Design a protein around this ligand. Structure first.
Ligand SMILES: *[C@@H](CC(=O)OCC)[C@H](C[C@H]1CCNC1=O)NC(=O)OC(C)(C)C
Ligand SMILES: *[C@@H](CC(=O)OCC)[C@H](C[C@H]1CCNC1=O)NC(=O)OC(C)(C)C
Lengths: 181, 181
């Protein structure tokens, strides 16, 4: 997992930030340009705090599969001038599976923390607190609140954004290339 | 840091447990035999919870330097029959310094989480919340409550037990070979 931790730390350091909305505090991954992603339930309003600074949200796309099913991700274009390193070549065309994965969190509650969640298996369909959601990854880990938005990774790969959990299972929304231009 | 994460995960998995006292919930490192260590302020009573199970505390040694100065560590002999893998060869004779270190936490609040704290420099003397304490290591990291007992590590080395913090600095009590037989 060392290589995965090493890739995780460098990714987080480069593309991640702590975001506060009216719905809580989240890890946020900058993707390319001024587009970043949050778990849908961050329900970002018209303005956000990004590393303690009021940032304007130009546009917000709450993603759904072609059948309308919830995928649980919001894309936000950010009213700022600095551009996010482009990490789209780190995102796959389809649900990545893996045996050693790392979940990276970066808030006031979990500042730069990393969790070896181990095995990540495409889970696909899940009733995400009453909401049928697709394209889920699952790992066995006693996840906790405060962790949403967490970035799921292995060496070389950004698998997904952490969205859900119960007890000893967490779930990430798979972060796929085509959601981005 | 990968090698350090890898050593950290394996150490934690082998020698660590979550401990509850009347003073809170702590990470605990089993050293050899049935002796483990906690930060002093865990002030363990006559019985402890160890991974949710009532365990009897045979003996408790709150360590001090020869001049009585606080070192901030309690050693506890545990009323159980299973023996802790002996990790004393992982503990140094003196305050280890390093450039890439990892702090491993393992409670209900931070279950199996790892933090790359980076540079660890012998700090020695610190006024640890009104208590002059010696043999401290320091790292720059925005540490948070719930983290005490955390195990501080690099590849091949167990440096210390996390005891203190303010804002962007945490402090570990150096975990030295001779505290143990
Ligand atoms: C992640 C959201 C969160 O952590 O709140 C602020 C960052 C929640 C899932 C955690 C609960 C148990 N395991 C977890 O990782 N999800 C959440 O609060 O919302 C729904 C949509 C109900 C999952
Ligand atoms: C560590 C103890 C703790 O986390 O409580 C339950 C596990 C506290 C130090 C944290 C505060 C800011 N940074 C930290 O890591 N220390 C503590 O509570 O006690 C004294 C002795 C005052 C440090």
């Amino acid at each position: 997992m060392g290589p995965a931790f090493e890739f995780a730390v460098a990714m987080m350091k480069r593309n991640s930030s702590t975001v506060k909305t009216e719905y809580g505090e989240f890890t946020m991954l900058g993707i390319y340009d001024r587009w970043a992603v949050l778990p849908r339930h961050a329900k970002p309003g018209p303005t956000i705090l990004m590393n303690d600074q009021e940032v304007g949200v130009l546009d917000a796309k709450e993603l759904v599969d072609k059948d309308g099913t919830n995928l649980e991700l919001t894309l936000l274009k950010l009213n700022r001038n600095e551009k996010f390193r482009d990490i789209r070549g780190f995102l796959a065309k389809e649900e990545v599976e893996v045996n050693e994965a790392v979940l990276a969190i970066n808030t006031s509650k979990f500042p730069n923390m990393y969790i070896p969640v181990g095995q990540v298996t495409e889970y696909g369909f899940l009733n995400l607190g009453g909401t049928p959601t697709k394209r889920m990854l699952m790992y066995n880990f006693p996840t906790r609140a405060g962790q949403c938005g967490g970035v799921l990774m292995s060496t070389g790969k950004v698998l997904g954004i952490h969205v859900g959990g119960n007890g000893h299972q967490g779930f990430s929304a798979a972060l796929l290339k085509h959601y981005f231009n």
